[PDB]
Ligand binder design. Sequence first.
Ligand code: HEM
Ligand SMILES: CSc1ccc(C(=O)O)cc1
Length: 393
Amino acid sequence: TIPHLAIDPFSLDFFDDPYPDQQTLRDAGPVVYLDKWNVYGVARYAEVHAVLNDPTTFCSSRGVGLSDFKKEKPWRPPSLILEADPPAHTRPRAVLSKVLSPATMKTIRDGFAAAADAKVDELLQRGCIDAIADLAEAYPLSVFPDAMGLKQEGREHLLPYAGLVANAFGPPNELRQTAIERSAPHQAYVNEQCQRPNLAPGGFGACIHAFTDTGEITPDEAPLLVRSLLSAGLQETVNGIGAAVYCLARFPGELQRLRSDPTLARNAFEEAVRFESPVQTFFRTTTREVELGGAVIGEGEKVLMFLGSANRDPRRWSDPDLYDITRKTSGHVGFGSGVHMCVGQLVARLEGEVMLSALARKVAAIDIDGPVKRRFNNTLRGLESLPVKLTPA
Ligand code: HEM
Ligand SMILES: CSc1ccc(C(=O)O)cc1
């Protein structure tokens, strides 16, 4: 009944151009079986959205990677939020939500915007830049570690650790094996940065430890929570910003619309998140036998959600492969959906907005003038190098 496909969604060939294979997965049926890894797959928006919003049946506590924690040991202690189900998920989720709250954005918005403006002014003095290293990477590195309260030393560990964590959600392929092999120095920096004496007062990390007397998290749970904010977000935001710059360069009519109305910057970044979906995939594990798209999925089965494919499903989006900064982006699953929907989404949107805002007000043209290189990761899609020439406004 269920179609069996041999597509490996974690192969380098798939990463190099996922979009044709994503259509094949969608059109094969609402639910597919991936013989390569013995997991079910859902690639349409309807089934992806439904799975994400049923956390009891499609749980996260048995891991959101390929590995089933009931069968294998997690490669690191489980995240108290990403790899937890309600009700254990609820109160730690509440703390991170309040730590990355609307009122917190109000405190950091001015500095994030001023740093974004200064960075763009700096790159314009140079003209020809790498939009990844010099912009998409440089800006989030210039604001997010400081907002976290991290020391100045050791920040070179942040992006390698983030990519390690992301690769480890994948199947036991070479990308995952080589990741976990290299984890040793990075996890030790992360170790020490999650401890309260090591986080600057006022930052995200200190605010997590200050929440340890409310009854929502204990003091011994705070280091793992700080780890969450060191294991997620930075690379995605970098990838999402680099995606927006790339799209503004390839869809030049959209930059002209952005220049003429800079208040489109927030939706311009949201549409970049939908268009590229920095987080391509996540797994769930069925806790019971369940019917999904006329399919019967047994207990203890891994279900692979193609978020990027759901964000390009023509059953849900008009012209899904086009970057449109005035598209109604509401409902895209680039940040997930339901109880686990990205708790850091306001931080990512703020960083993305003020960068695209600085570009909208200061840049006239963005022209690719060099070879574009892609970075491969079991979970994340993003560019490694994007040589562009920035023309000032
Ligand atoms: C473009 C930027 C980002 C993208 C595309 C993204 C993607 C996602 C997705 C899809 C999820 C859902 C995981 C699931 O349902 O299993 C998630 C959760 C999460 N994200 Fe983000 N994220 C981004 C930025 C950030 C930032 C900036 C932070 C931290 C400051 C962050 C921290 C987290 C955490 C801690 C979770 C776990 C939430 C939970 O399990 O309840 N992410 N992210
Ligand atoms: C790449 S999405 C993500 C990764 C790690 C965590 C965590 O460590 O809790 C949460 C979300």
